[PDB]
Design a protein around this ligand. Sequence first.
Ligand SMILES: [Zn+2]
Lengths: 65, 98, 227, 141, 70, 53, 52
Amino acid sequence: MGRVRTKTVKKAARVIIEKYYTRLGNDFHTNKRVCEEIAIIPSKKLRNKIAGYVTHLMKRIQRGP
Amino acid sequence: MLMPKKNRIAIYELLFKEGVMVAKKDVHMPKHPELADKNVPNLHVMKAMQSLKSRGYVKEQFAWRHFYWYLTNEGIQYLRDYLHLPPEIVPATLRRSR
Amino acid sequence: MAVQISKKRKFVADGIFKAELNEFLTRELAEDGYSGVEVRVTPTRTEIIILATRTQNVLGEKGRRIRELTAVVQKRFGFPEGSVELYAEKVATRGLCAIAQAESLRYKLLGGLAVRRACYGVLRFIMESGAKGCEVVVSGKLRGQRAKSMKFVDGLMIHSGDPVNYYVDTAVRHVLLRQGVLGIKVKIMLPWDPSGKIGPKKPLPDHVSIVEPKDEILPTTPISEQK
Amino acid sequence: VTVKDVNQQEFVRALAAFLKKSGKLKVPEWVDTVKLAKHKELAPYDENWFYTRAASTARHLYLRGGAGVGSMTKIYGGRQRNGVMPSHFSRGSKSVARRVLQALEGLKMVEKDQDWGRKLTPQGQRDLDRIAGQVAAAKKK
Amino acid sequence: HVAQIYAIRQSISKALVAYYQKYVDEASKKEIKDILIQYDRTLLVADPRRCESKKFGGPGARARYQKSYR
Amino acid sequence: QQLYWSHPRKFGQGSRSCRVCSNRHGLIRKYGLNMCRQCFRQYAKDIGFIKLD
Amino acid sequence: TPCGEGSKTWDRFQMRIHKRLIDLHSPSEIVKQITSISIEPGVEVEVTIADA
RNA sequence: GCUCUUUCUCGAUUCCGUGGGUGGUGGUGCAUGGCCGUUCUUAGUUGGUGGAGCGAUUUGUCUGGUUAAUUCCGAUAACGAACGAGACUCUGGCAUGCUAACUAGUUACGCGACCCCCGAGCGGUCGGCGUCCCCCAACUUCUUAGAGGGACAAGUGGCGUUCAGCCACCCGAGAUUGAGCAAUAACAGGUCUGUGAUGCCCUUAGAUGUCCGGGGCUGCACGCGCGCUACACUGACUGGCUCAGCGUGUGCCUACCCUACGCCGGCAGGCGCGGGUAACCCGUUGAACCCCAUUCGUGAUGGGGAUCGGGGAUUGCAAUUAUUCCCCAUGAACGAGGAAUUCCCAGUAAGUGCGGGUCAUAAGCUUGCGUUGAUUAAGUCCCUGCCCUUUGUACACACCGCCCGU
Ligand SMILES: [Zn+2]
């Protein structure tokens, strides 16, 4: 249950974790609010799909860069 | 239909009372707009006016089954002499900012 | 209108009058930079704005074309004399209204030059104006005795979804050439992210923005200071 | 007890006993030959249906009052089988419905209340609840 | 008729579910809720499924009028 | 004269015509529009009608 | 399809409409002040005095 | 007062030939515009600079895994970008939280009253009301709609080059409601019968212009394509019973709207009449199959409701080749349907009913709404077809191709 997040989400999420890597965490709910403050996300849905990749991507970085 | 002269002047007065005269295309309504009290059956405004337009003194237009006939500025001198009204330059133009 | 007609009919009759007015208006302001009009019910009044660029026609000698066109409406739409007056305005930026380009393209076609020199000029002007994209399609008997089509493109050009409701502006005009009728379609992508002249729902669904972090500018070694 | 605690399908049969016991309301001269609606194809098998019909419409007044001919014709309806064409809804008879209401007037059962809608008298309600005390006393589900 | 029944069998249950919290112990919910849920899910959770729109083409949502072949 | 218009047209399909093209087939009359099908489609935008669903 | 041919394809146009109703309890000239400056959008304002 | 015949007037606006045809549902959609359909509902499409070939072209657009998807991660003589997808809009879900509601609920209450012993109850408190209230009651669960909020492969476990992702599960709307929108290149796909949008030709007074009358577009040895009705007993006839949701509805360049309630009439209908330009009265929309009783008894039976005669009303200038609707009556074809063939996988199939549209008279049609509620699948290319790559060609209006010999 899940989809391929297109280059819109993958590019948007990778910059966020590349610019605010310290202010982010493990849990989606924390990250959802953070993303809105630091990014002008036009749509409610995609903000929760960008925040989805960010928390999935942090689970990646703690497991070998 | 044709040949009023005591009942063709009626529209002319409106045509110079205001520099425009709207109409319709339906020919069967004797409820002519703008004070048709002189028994005009909505003809003579699309029978005699096609003469007035084709001379160059008034100008025509069509918009959704309608006509928006305009009295040209240089048609005033023509439609001041047949109406033999006093020498005047005010169809509807106060010629001031309104 | 003498029993205060139902809300459904009265609101749809608002559009029809705002539909009759526009189709009539373009038949007179065609040689002018007509763009589209708006009407509002001002307190115990009525004002209709002719959004145009070639205003020198509508201004009138001491206000006569206004006097000429207000009357032709009152005699037609039943308005009482003494509360309907038309005001003119200037669309200070005209390189982004599709109708202005379309007629000016019909203007220059009938003027008597080739379509290819004429279209690129409009295509250039709509770029010298500045837009995220633009597109002109001229179809008909361009050459010979057979109908062809021709398409000019540049810039971003969205084609599907909700954003086309408020960025993309389209327009159609039939040109009367010596060999029949040809059509013009002009489309312009409007850029304004802030509130421009004609404010869109400015952001773009695909545009995800990012701002400067401004953190870890100092190591922040322990210092104590009492304000 | 109250009407709102008893079986309605047997209740109308119960009151069909009462109007046979009173037996003086009226029975129209045409009960033989009318159809009770415009969509049926055959008059009721039971010839003494006026005690039944007047048991219903008087009973329905107890639950949705203010009802005239229409609200009694609307309830009396079903398929109107036009045969080949699809069926529809078709209201019941008008005159047959009102003759019940007038007949109840003579018995003083119902009355025309404010808003011109048939309602029920405070003695009229006594009859409807009284018989309820009998069916309820002789039947537990 | 059936819709109302599937409503009253839920409303009554969710009435007592909601009642026991406000003036009785929370366990009185759980001794009841779990016995309620382990019997039928719907008595606690409303039926979300609802009729969907109809498309032109087909008397229903997804049926179709036949196609004619020469 | 008398036979120019002898038709009592306060009803029927001759009474109602599209208020744009003077034509008489495929009409919208829902809200007094009286327009034909096509002239409504060409104008649905400006009246306020949306191809939304 | 205008009148000629095609697979049976139908538009579904719409047109929505809304409304809000309010009462004010004061001398009625004050209201005419506040409602005079708000005619700017395309919004209808009909104000009654008889509880219609 | 078309004419024949002539008597009255507008009286130079009429009237005759030449010039220009305005006019036209007249011909050409194989001259066009625009608007639609289809190729094609899949995932595909271009160019800037760079490399290769002299060149048409090519690479980017792929070895591989992956997903609804040229959607990704990757691999890399390509790099950086645009379109389509996705993203967006509407819609359905649920939020005991929020600002609010006499045109909504209120309904929980005060029991402020009114009524039936209407029953356990002597009776009150109880249960009920078909009821009755002003706001100086309590609000917002349901009713409505604004901002919100919410779901995102997030939590856990397997599988995976361990990247993209998939499978399963507590949680709960588990990412999954349905649509709108829709690219590149086209078709001699339809439309000149939608248009004062139009080229050319036809014609314009014995009119192919218009207006009026009566007809015809519906005519019967035939074959066709979308559809309603059934063939019955889970059914039909009769009685009781109780529940719904989109909308819709009156003076408009124009002629008539939705309808309670009282009486007359079996009914179809009629006459006074009292509301509505509408969360206000229709309408608490008290719809149907379905729920409970009697009759019919395998029988062309009462299933079936075609055909034909007589009657009775309605809308209209006109119902006859029967506009509709009612009543009596005749009671046929049909015993579940060959070869073929279409539609569908969840409140969907399928049944029943109700709105809108056409509409003066009105649906067996179509556009929508709700109610009753499955069986059979979680998959494959076997058929008709589609996308990408490798190979073949004597095809290029492209297999509906080409082509061989008496
Ligand atoms: Zn039209």
